[PDB]
Amino acid sequence: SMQEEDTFRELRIFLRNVTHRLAIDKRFRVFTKPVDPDEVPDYVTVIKQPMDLSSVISKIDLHKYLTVKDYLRDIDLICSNALEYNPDRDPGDRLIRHRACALRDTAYAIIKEELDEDFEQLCEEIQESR
Numbered sequence: 001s002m003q004e005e006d007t008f009r010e011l012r013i014f015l016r017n018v019t020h021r022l023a024i025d026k027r028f029r030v031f032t033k034p035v036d037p038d039e040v041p042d043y044v045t046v047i048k049q050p051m052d053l054s055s056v057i058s059k060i061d062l063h064k065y066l067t068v069k070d071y072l073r074d075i076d077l078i079c080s081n082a083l084e085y086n087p088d089r090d091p092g093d094r095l096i097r098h099r100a101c102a103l104r105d106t107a108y109a110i111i112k113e114e115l116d117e118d119f120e121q122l123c124e125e126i127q128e129s130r
């Protein structure tokens with residue numbers, strides 16, 4: 001229905017706003033664009049499902065997220081990819097892991113404060129009906 005289309009539109013607006021706030025944070029610059037194959041040639045072979053905040057924005061716009069739960073799976077993917085690809089004890093790896101965890105925690109904290117649980121429940125029930 002039109003009311004359900006309005007619901008998903010509000011969802012997309014909410015998700016774009018959260019994603020923009022993550023993307024403008026200096027700590028998360030490394031997660032804003034896909035990894036350059038020339039800079040890191042073995043990334044595509046190690047990480048089977050690359051994800052980044054520009055890709056998340058594209059997915060929002062392609063109507064790929066019908067719930068905030070599905071959005072958070074891609075945020076979690078950004079984080080887990082970073083922890084997997086940069087597992088070493090050296091400062092470079094520890095910095096990126098710390099930032100990855102901060103991205104995840106920040107996304108979840110914004111959602112905890114600003115997502116109405118009944119709005120999410122409506123989205124899930126529309127999704128489940130389709």
Ligand SMILES: Cc1cc2ccccc2[nH]c1=O
Binds near residue numbers: 030039085
């Ligand atoms: C996302 C990402 C980027 C990167 C760039 C250079 C070296 C290592 C890297 N690891 C990453 O996880």
